[PDB]
Amino acid sequence: EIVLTQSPAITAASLGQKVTITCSASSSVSYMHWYQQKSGTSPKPWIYEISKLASGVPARFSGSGSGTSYSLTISSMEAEDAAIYYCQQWNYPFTFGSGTKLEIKRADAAPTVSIFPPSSEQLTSGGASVVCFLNNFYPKDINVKWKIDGSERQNGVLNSWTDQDSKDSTYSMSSTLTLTKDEYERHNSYTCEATHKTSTSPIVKSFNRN
């Protein structure tokens, strides 16, 4: 069995910097292909047979290597270059590498937190979801904590994260506390707390039901 491991697994490159990613084969392979995949779309052939650029590929990309090690290099990083790159064995069973997520490095940014009480219509239907958005922050690492009447609530919240924003290169996160109208009315204080590396102080947003 031949296994293709790529490195780095993830890295944030600044615009204009040279970027080099690698693909290591468990055993020697004659040729290697590369692909570029952007969120929610089919992989696009990027490089064929170690060094031939595919259609639609900028000259700033180049491929090289042999045996058990191959590399894809971007002479100068450009915004549109942010994506996930996969290498692939040139022959049966056409094994794909583990992938490399290339992101854009930008200045640190604290999250803008917004909390939302349940809507009138959800309440009327007997439900009560409290929503919190932690938007446009950087780097990606972040943690959210919920407090009901001052008590931290664990396990019972749906969290989701977006990929880097195609426009300002930031990240965003959504956290939802789902309760019944009854549970919601049981208490009065709801708090969403975001902790990012930009501050030792959590960014807190809260509201009182009454």
Binding site: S30, Y31, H33, T41, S42, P43, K44, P45, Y48, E49, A54, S55, Y86, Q88, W90, N91, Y92, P93, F94, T95, F96, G97, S98, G99, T112, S114, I115, F116, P117, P118, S119, E121, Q122, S125, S129, V131, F133, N135, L158, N159, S160, W161, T162, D165, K167, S172, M173, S174, T176, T178, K205, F207
Partner: protein
Amino acid sequence: EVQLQQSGAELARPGASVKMSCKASGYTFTSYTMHWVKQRPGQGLEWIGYINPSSGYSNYNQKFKDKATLTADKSSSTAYMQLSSLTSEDSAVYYCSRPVVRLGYNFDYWGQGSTLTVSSAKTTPPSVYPLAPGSAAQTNSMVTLGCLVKGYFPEPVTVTWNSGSLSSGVHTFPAVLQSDLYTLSSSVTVPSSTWPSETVTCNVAHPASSTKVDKKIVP
């Protein structure tokens, strides 16, 4: 003009079978093989096998033998892939690709992919709730609104704001599964001078249940 049009999203029960298609055009169908690739939610790609339309011959990745069955119809220039004895491990996006042979196969053309969901859950429309501020984000020059698209199945749903007129400050989050039902949210951030002064509506569509929702965000 090489184009590969794949069939739509599929929902199948465990133990059942499904057959996806890939309609080719823009080239001589029988002159090139057609390969299929699998990509599970949140991870890497896996090659399944190929069919050679000129002879009907097929070769498979050992892992997919007796799992996938690849056929082709010369008259309709369409490649097919049947998957049997479905399990949750079969849920993924499947692509077809037509490679050209040079020093080796060069997979220069790909279909848009077909998403397969293996589950016993039934189709359910989403409930869309408006997410309006509670007088506190005013301190911010920018106001953030949103829509909670709750309890639907299966994927996917599409979300636009003001029918596409608002796209810049939009963040639509990946759906998450809760108790076998999907929930996702979408937020839009606009200048406080834009709303409530002007109308902001989220347009949510859920093809599986032929649902269309235009939820206006009222204070």
